[PDB]
Amino acid sequence: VFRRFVEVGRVAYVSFGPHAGKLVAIVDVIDQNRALVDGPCTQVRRQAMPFKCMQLTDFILKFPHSAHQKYVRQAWQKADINTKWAATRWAKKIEARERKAKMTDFDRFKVMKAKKMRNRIIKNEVKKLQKAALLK
Amino acid sequence: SHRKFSAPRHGSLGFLPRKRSSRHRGKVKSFPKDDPSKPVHLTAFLGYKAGMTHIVREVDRPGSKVNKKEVVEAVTIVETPPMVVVGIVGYVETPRGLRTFKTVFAEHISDECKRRFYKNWHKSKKKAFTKYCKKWQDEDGKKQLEKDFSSMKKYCQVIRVIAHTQMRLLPLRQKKAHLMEIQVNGGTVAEKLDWARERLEQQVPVNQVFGQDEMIDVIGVTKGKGYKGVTSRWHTKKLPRKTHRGLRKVACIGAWHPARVAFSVARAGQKGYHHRTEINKKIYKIGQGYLIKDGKLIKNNASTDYDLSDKSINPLGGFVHYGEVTNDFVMLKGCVVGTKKRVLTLRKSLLV
Amino acid sequence: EVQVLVLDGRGHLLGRLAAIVAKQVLLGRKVVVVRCEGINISGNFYRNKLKYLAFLRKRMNTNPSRGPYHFRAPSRIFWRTVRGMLPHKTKRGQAALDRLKVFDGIPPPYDKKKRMVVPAALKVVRLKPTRKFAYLGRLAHEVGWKYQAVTATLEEKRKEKAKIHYRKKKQLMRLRKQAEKNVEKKIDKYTEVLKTHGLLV
Amino acid sequence: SGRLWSKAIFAGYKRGLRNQREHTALLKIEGVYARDETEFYLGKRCAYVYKAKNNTVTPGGKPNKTRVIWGKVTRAHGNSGMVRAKFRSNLPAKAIGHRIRVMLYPSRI
Amino acid sequence: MKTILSNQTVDIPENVDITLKGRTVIVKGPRGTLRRDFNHINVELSLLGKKKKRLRVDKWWGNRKELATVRTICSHVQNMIKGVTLGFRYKMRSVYAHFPINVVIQENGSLVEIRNFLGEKYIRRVRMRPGVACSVSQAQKDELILEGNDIELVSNSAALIQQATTVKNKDIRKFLDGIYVSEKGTVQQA
RNA sequence: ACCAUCUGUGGGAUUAUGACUGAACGCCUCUAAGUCAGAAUCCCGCCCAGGCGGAACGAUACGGCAGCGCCGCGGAGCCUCGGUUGGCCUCGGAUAGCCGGUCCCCCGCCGGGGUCCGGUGCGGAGUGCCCUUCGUCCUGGGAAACGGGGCGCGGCCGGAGAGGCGGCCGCCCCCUCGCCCGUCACGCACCGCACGUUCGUGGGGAACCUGGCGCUAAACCAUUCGUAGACGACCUGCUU
RNA sequence: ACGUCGCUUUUUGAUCCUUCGAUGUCGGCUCUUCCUAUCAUUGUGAAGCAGAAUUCACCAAGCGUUGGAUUGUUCACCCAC
RNA sequence: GCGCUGCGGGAUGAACCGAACGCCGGGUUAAGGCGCCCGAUGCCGACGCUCAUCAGACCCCAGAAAAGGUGUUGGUUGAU
Ligand SMILES: COc1ccc(C[C@H]2NC[C@H](O)[C@H]2OC(C)=O)cc1
Ligand SMILES: [K+]
Ligand SMILES: [K+]
Ligand SMILES: [K+]
Ligand SMILES: [Mg+2]
Ligand SMILES: [Mg+2]
Ligand SMILES: [Mg+2]
Ligand SMILES: [Mg+2]
Ligand SMILES: [Mg+2]
Ligand SMILES: [Mg+2]
Ligand SMILES: [Mg+2]
Ligand SMILES: [Mg+2]
Ligand SMILES: [Mg+2]
Ligand SMILES: [Mg+2]
Ligand SMILES: [Mg+2]
Ligand SMILES: [Mg+2]
Ligand SMILES: [Mg+2]
Ligand SMILES: [Mg+2]
Ligand SMILES: [Mg+2]
Ligand SMILES: [Mg+2]
Ligand SMILES: [Mg+2]
Ligand SMILES: [Mg+2]
Ligand SMILES: [Mg+2]
Ligand SMILES: [Mg+2]
Ligand SMILES: [Mg+2]
Numbered sequence A: 001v002f003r004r005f006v007e008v009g010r011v012a013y014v015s016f017g018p019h020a021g022k023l024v025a026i027v028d029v030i031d032q033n034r035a036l037v038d039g040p041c042t043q044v045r046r047q048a049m050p051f052k053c054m055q056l057t058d059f060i061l062k063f064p065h066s067a068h069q070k071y072v073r074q075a076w077q078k079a080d081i082n083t084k085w086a087a088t089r090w091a092k093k094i095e096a097r098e099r100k101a102k103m104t105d106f107d108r109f110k111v112m113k114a115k116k117m118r119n120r121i122i123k124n125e126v127k128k129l130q131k132a133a134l135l136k
Numbered sequence B: 001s002h003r004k005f006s007a008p009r010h011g012s013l014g015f016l017p018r019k020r021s022s023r024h025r026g027k028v029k030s031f032p033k034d035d036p037s038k039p040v041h042l043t044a045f046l047g048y049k050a051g052m053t054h055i056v057r058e059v060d061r062p063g064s065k066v067n068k069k070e071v072v073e074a075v076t077i078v079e080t081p082p083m084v085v086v087g088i089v090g091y092v093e094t095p096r097g098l099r100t101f102k103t104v105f106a107e108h109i110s111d112e113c114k115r116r117f118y119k120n121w122h123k124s125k126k127k128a129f130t131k132y133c134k135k136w137q138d139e140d141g142k143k144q145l146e147k148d149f150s151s152m153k154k155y156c157q158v159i160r161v162i163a164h165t166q167m168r169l170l171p172l173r174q175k176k177a178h179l180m181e182i183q184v185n186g187g188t189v190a191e192k193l194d195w196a197r198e199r200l201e202q203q204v205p206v207n208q209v210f211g212q213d214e215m216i217d218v219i220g221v222t223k224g225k226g227y228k229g230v231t232s233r234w235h236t237k238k239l240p241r242k243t244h245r246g247l248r249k250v251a252c253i254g255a256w257h258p259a260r261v262a263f264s265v266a267r268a269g270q271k272g273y274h275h276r277t278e279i280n281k282k283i284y285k286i287g288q289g290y291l292i293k294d295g296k297l298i299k300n301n302a303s304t305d306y307d308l309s310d311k312s313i314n315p316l317g318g319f320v321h322y323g324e325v326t327n328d329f330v331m332l333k334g335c336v337v338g339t340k341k342r343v344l345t346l347r348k349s350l351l352v
Numbered sequence C: 001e002v003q004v005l006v007l008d009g010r011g012h013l014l015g016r017l018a019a020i021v022a023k024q025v026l027l028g029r030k031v032v033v034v035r036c037e038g039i040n041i042s043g044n045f046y047r048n049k050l051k052y053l054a055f056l057r058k059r060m061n062t063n064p065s066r067g068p069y070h071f072r073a074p075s076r077i078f079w080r081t082v083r084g085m086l087p088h089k090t091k092r093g094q095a096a097l098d099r100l101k102v103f104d105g106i107p108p109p110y111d112k113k114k115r116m117v118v119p120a121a122l123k124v125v126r127l128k129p130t131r132k133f134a135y136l137g138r139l140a141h142e143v144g145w146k147y148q149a150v151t152a153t154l155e156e157k158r159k160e161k162a163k164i165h166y167r168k169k170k171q172l173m174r175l176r177k178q179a180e181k182n183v184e185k186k187i188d189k190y191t192e193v194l195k196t197h198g199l200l201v
Numbered sequence D: 001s002g003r004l005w006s007k008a009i010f011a012g013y014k015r016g017l018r019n020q021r022e023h024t025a026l027l028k029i030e031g032v033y034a035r036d037e038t039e040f041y042l043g044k045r046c047a048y049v050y051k052a053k054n055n056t057v058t059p060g061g062k063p064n065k066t067r068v069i070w071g072k073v074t075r076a077h078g079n080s081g082m083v084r085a086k087f088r089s090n091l092p093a094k095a096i097g098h099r100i101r102v103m104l105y106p107s108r109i
Numbered sequence E: 001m002k003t004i005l006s007n008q009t010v011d012i013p014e015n016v017d018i019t020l021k022g023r024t025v026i027v028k029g030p031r032g033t034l035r036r037d038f039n040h041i042n043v044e045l046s047l048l049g050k051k052k053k054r055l056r057v058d059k060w061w062g063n064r065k066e067l068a069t070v071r072t073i074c075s076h077v078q079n080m081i082k083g084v085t086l087g088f089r090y091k092m093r094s095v096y097a098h099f100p101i102n103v104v105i106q107e108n109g110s111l112v113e114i115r116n117f118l119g120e121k122y123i124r125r126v127r128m129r130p131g132v133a134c135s136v137s138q139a140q141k142d143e144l145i146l147e148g149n150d151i152e153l154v155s156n157s158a159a160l161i162q163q164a165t166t167v168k169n170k171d172i173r174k175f176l177d178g179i180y181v182s183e184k185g186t187v188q189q190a
Numbered sequence F: 001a002c003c004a005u006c007u008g009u010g011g012g013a014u015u016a017u018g019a020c021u022g023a024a025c026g027c028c029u030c031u032a033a034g035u036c037a038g039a040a041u042c043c044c045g046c047c048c049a050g051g052c053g054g055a056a057c058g059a060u061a062c063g064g065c066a067g068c069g070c071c072g073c074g075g076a077g078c079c080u081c082g083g084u085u086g087g088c089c090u091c092g093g094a095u096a097g098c099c100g101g102u103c104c105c106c107c108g109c110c111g112g113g114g115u116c117c118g119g120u121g122c123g124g125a126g127u128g129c130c131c132u133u134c135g136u137c138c139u140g141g142g143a144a145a146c147g148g149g150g151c152g153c154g155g156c157c158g159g160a161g162a163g164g165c166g167g168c169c170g171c172c173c174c175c176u177c178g179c180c181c182g183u184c185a186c187g188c189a190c191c192g193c194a195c196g197u198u199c200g201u202g203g204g205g206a207a208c209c210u211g212g213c214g215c216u217a218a219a220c221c222a223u224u225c226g227u228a229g230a231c232g233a234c235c236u237g238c239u240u
Numbered sequence G: 001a002c003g004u005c006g007c008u009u010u011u012u013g014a015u016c017c018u019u020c021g022a023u024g025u026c027g028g029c030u031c032u033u034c035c036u037a038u039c040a041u042u043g044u045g046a047a048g049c050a051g052a053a054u055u056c057a058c059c060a061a062g063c064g065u066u067g068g069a070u071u072g073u074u075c076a077c078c079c080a081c
Numbered sequence H: 001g002c003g004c005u006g007c008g009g010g011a012u013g014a015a016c017c018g019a020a021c022g023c024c025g026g027g028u029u030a031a032g033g034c035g036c037c038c039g040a041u042g043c044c045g046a047c048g049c050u051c052a053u054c055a056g057a058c059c060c061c062a063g064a065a066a067a068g069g070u071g072u073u074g075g076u077u078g079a080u
């Protein structure tokens, strides 16, 4: 039933802590609680990091365990995780949250005017589909 | 220290408090469980304690010393004139219990039943149900009543008929009728309403509720005795004759600790007039009331297949402090609670 | 936040939920707890049943009518748990206690309202999967609660009605997704404004 | 027109367990459930708005039933978004659990 | 410690179909269908292979106790595979010193009436678990044949009969009277 | 008056224990997960009482022009209690999994199941969604024209767990304004300042005026009864 | 058995903290409740348990544990059920 | 040290732990705490250990021993 496994090369998204919001690659497993992570292209140096702050992604890199950061960086750039991650809905949901928290007072006014109008265009078309289905 | 010799406690704590009953008419605290397979039937009836006589009968009890031998058994005569159904009440099963859903009354209500609604009938204008009865005639009322019956059909799980006794047929000073709710068991709820609607304003004889050779329960209020001491109320041992300050007492009403008198200690107070529910009172005879046949009066309800004497259940000179029993009666084995003239609730057995 | 906080009791731990509720009613915040029969208690059933039977043994010896009242209904058990967590012998605590309503099952009007959970009291969150737990409904039914079957029958009726309402919502939502695709040209420019500020993905 | 003030609850007075310091009030502000989030509200004017029987003068209006005790948020309290406030008169105990208006001024944002 | 991984795999016969609905195991075979629910055990069940099927039970990070259920589930599944292919046949023998134990089968193997156990005028009415059929052996006397697909139902039905015929207030070392399970086997022989 | 006579009761989870399936520990094992039988115990029923706990139903004050009910969100004013300062109208639930959408089979335009396709750090997202307040004038595009607004009317359907609420249709009147972006200027712009904004035509006690519709009682004492009783209370009767 | 670890406050001691401007002392009688370290009765396990009887142990205090001679007696002892 | 002494904590308490006291505001602590009563963990606290059909839960302090367990978790000495 499981689909995402902790393994050498698995790319994880850091949820909280000093490196919150960054991707890392699992280089080695220390024990049941900690793993040796290394984000060379994401500005996270090699260090121990608990599994409690890691969210597994659907990305696996191919490098042997405890390899030097050079080989982790080569595999990271070879698969080009940075652009692939940005194309995912996971990252898009993240950036949407940043934009929403970044809305100025003027932006909130502009979004509301758009909501007063778009939801209203959708409402009429819903009512039309109500009536069309009723006759049919 | 422990009591030197063991002895059972005097009286039962399961009949507390020993207070005067809040009701004069016996209350059915539990009606028999409903089996929809059984035909639609009433579960209870109201009667009046006329008095007691004794009978003679042959006992068919294999292995007994009275097998095929005649015995004398005391029986109680309960006068049960037919009851009139004047209303239907519906109940809905709620997580807080059973809730009275809707009540529908019949169009015509006798002055016997209407007396139950008034503390001083003599001074009243007897206006009860005068505007309600018009619902059965007005077109708006007829629809409203039909909505009530359909809503009771759709939502209620317990259906009861409201029935009253006919005090005009009894030899009592009281003319105010005792009204009670009688649960209707058997069938589906739809069948219960159909059955109960027909019986509206109709009379129900006792032989349609109970049968011969049936174990039934009798519910009523015992005979009042007034304020009684512990010797009579709880049957505690009388103290020695030399006892100063009186001897019809309980000597020790509790230990030093706990420093309060407990509820389990015998105390003086009200005795009798307590609501009680005695069970397994066998029906020996369902007697017929006085009948007029082709000019003559038929009153030989006390005649058996072996004593063809044309006599009524009434003892020579009439039942003492009750009167003459001219209506239907039920002959119950043994004694039942209440004085003479006490109204008794007859309920079907809850057991198998 | 809401004027009246309606909490589904199902899947929640009795004491944890009581602590959260007790604080809220002390801070104003009228609270309504429903499905108290669905509340769970940590530890195996027999241990918890022993605990409540031991509660039944506590009666004033001289006069049990004045002694502790053992309430059998799951609602009243939870209500008594909350009362233990309040200063109920002061006017402040009593006023706080009046702000709490507890119900077995979901009675009207709360059956047609959105019900909120408390993840700090949820059994799936607070208990390890290998620990035994007890259902307040079964525990109450075995200490003298009479209406386990009636509540279960009425809850099944309510769940039938709520599915018809949900099928209607799924039909309405399928239509609203259809509506957006039909008028996308007329709402394109408004969609970009929402996408620019993260209101849509 | 709109709310223009933040909702707060008069949770209780500054206290240990067996000693109560009524000159200081503890306020809970909705949306503020961490200590680091309280820095916005420090120094903001606070109002306990109630009604009495007699009419009292109203600034910029006619006399009505409304009275106010004016205060100000002084510092954070605990790790959970509570704040301390001092009012020009000690808050009456009947107000515990009631609404305190946390203003948007004195503004620094 | 907590072991990282512990798995046991059970084979599946070509004539048996197993489907998984989460932790619910549905086993279908010539003799019928058996369903079991394993929601009380936190394990991962997977089906492997297409030409020949294979069920694997996975447990990650379990303690000594959680580790023990891995073989328990596998044994239960193998029993279900046995039930739908060959079935279960629990043979009971009636042992009596003086009073023969008279067993009559009613309601097509659903009710077993036991008479004259120890000379008692009490007739024992033992109701078989659903899906379990009891019959009196024809080859050999004093023998009962319990047949069913669920080892647990068939064996519990035998247990109900065995504890029905219990000697009380007597030295049970003597008085070896009752119906006892003598053989555990299968309706079909492989 | 055991000194006569009658009546005394059914379930459930389980204890001890005995077991089933079954690992741990290739065997074994009543136990670890799972399951069964189980008793003067326990809990409930039966039975006694009946909450500063509810329910359903009846009747609701007259020749005085009186008392009352209901409607007309009728007209004001009075005293008195204040809190609050948008709404969310709902699947069931799972958690070693879940959510959504389709092409076929059977339950009868339903619903269920089997595939298949998506989503899953939940975006068909409560970290969410909906609504939105300065008003008006001139004036042009969008959007809409299947449109809005009326305790305006009448009717229908659904809701009983505590329904005390929700929806639909027919007609009449009314406006084509309402919502997005533009043109156009105006409103006390009260000269920096607090209790502003809402629910709200709030709840309660009255005292008037105003129009319509509607109603004409019972309780207690006294008396009586004696199925009752220390006194209260209680069961009763008082022109067919 | 030799040893050895405990529990109880149903005996007696030890102590003298409370009460000497006073807490009525023994025993019985009456009455309620409670404890279990269970005599009986319900369900059971074990035996040097064939049956009957008996003994040991478990769940268990729901229910019961009496009538007398002598004695002020608690306590004893006997008669009888 | 109490008596002669309040005050914070120890629920409660003459002696314990902190600390000794004019009437107040602000700040900070001690001992002790921070699920709710009840101020403070509403930290995405860390690493384990433990399932109790009499669990356990904080000086004084307010209940327990010898002895035993194929419960489980570590560790020691050997052996195949
Ligand atoms: C030898 O037996 C006894 C010795 C003395 C007392 C009386 C005392 N007991 C407690 C009190 O100090 C005093 O009571 C009274 C009222 O004086 C009773 C029995
Ligand atoms: K004594
Ligand atoms: K004012
Ligand atoms: K003395
Ligand atoms: Mg004794
Ligand atoms: Mg009842
Ligand atoms: Mg004398
Ligand atoms: Mg009880
Ligand atoms: Mg009770
Ligand atoms: Mg024997
Ligand atoms: Mg046997
Ligand atoms: Mg007698
Ligand atoms: Mg049973
Ligand atoms: Mg085995
Ligand atoms: Mg067992
Ligand atoms: Mg069982
Ligand atoms: Mg206001
Ligand atoms: Mg010795
Ligand atoms: Mg002394
Ligand atoms: Mg004295
Ligand atoms: Mg004194
Ligand atoms: Mg005294
Ligand atoms: Mg004596
Ligand atoms: Mg014992
Ligand atoms: Mg007892």
Ligand SMILES: [Mg+2]
Binding pocket: G071
């Ligand atoms: Mg003598």
Ligand SMILES: [Mg+2]
Binding pocket: none
């Ligand atoms: Mg001195």
Ligand SMILES: [Mg+2]
Binding pocket: none
């Ligand atoms: Mg000194």
Ligand SMILES: [Mg+2]
Binding pocket: H005
């Ligand atoms: Mg000191």
Ligand SMILES: [Mg+2]
Binding pocket: none
């Ligand atoms: Mg202190």
Ligand SMILES: [Mg+2]
Binding pocket: H010
């Ligand atoms: Mg202490």
Ligand SMILES: [Mg+2]
Binding pocket: none
């Ligand atoms: Mg200070």
Ligand SMILES: [Mg+2]
Binding pocket: none
């Ligand atoms: Mg410290």
Ligand SMILES: [Mg+2]
Binding pocket: none
């Ligand atoms: Mg504390």
Ligand SMILES: [Mg+2]
Binding pocket: none
């Ligand atoms: Mg707090």
